[PDB]
């Protein structure tokens, strides 16, 4: 295989149109890769999953579109991995990672705990736990959770084979 030419670009590849639109002054760090541009592999995804879980960065974190975006951006900036990789299965329920080796799923939060997080009138209005699935097409409050079985079982393909 090759190393990236029109084949995509900003008018036919969704990540390109979204990557070329991000401004460095808006995110907080340069949007240019430090490591030469390279794709995400199995080993890189597993290593990154363990790095993110073991030190309390992503585990138990409530999902946000902003959050996902800057995770893509920070990993692309610090590692050179192109944001083609952090996709999850549609439909209500658990979202499994389409990338085999990325050991992170999105589980929905129980409505009782969601309401117990929005109790009290001092809660910030634009917090991810305050959005009630605003960033979700199925309007679910999602949460990042690590799973070891995702490294050996490609649950995404097995459930929804149509993408591959």
């Amino acid at each position: 295989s090759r190393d990236l030419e029109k084949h995509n670009t900003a008018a036919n590849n969704a990540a390109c149109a979204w990557l070329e639109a991000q401004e460095e002054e808006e995110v907080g760090f340069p949007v240019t890769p430090q490591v030469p541009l390279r794709p995400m592999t199995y080993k890189a995804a597993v290593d990154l999953s363990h790095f993110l879980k073991e030190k309390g960065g992503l585990e138990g974190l409530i999902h946000s579109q902003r959050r996902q975006d800057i995770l893509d951006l920070w990993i692309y900036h610090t590692q050179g991995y192109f944001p083609d990789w952090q996709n999850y299965t549609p439909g209500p329920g658990v979202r499994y990672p389409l990338t085999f080796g990325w050991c992170y799923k999105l589980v929905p939060v129980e409505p009782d705990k969601v309401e117990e997080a929005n109790k009290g009138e001092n809660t910030s209005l634009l917090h991810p736990v305050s959005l009630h699935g605003m960033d979700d097409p199925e309007r679910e409050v999602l949460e990042w959770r690590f799973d070891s079985r995702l490294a050996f079982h490609h649950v995404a393909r097995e459930l929804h084979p149509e993408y591959f």
Binding site: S1, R2, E5, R38, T41, H154
Partner: peptide
């Protein structure tokens, strides 16, 4: 030897 990724990464190699 990359993963179950989108198109762009398929362009990079494998």
């Amino acid at each position: 030897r990359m993963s179950q990724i989108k198109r762009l990464l398929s362009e990079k190699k494998t």
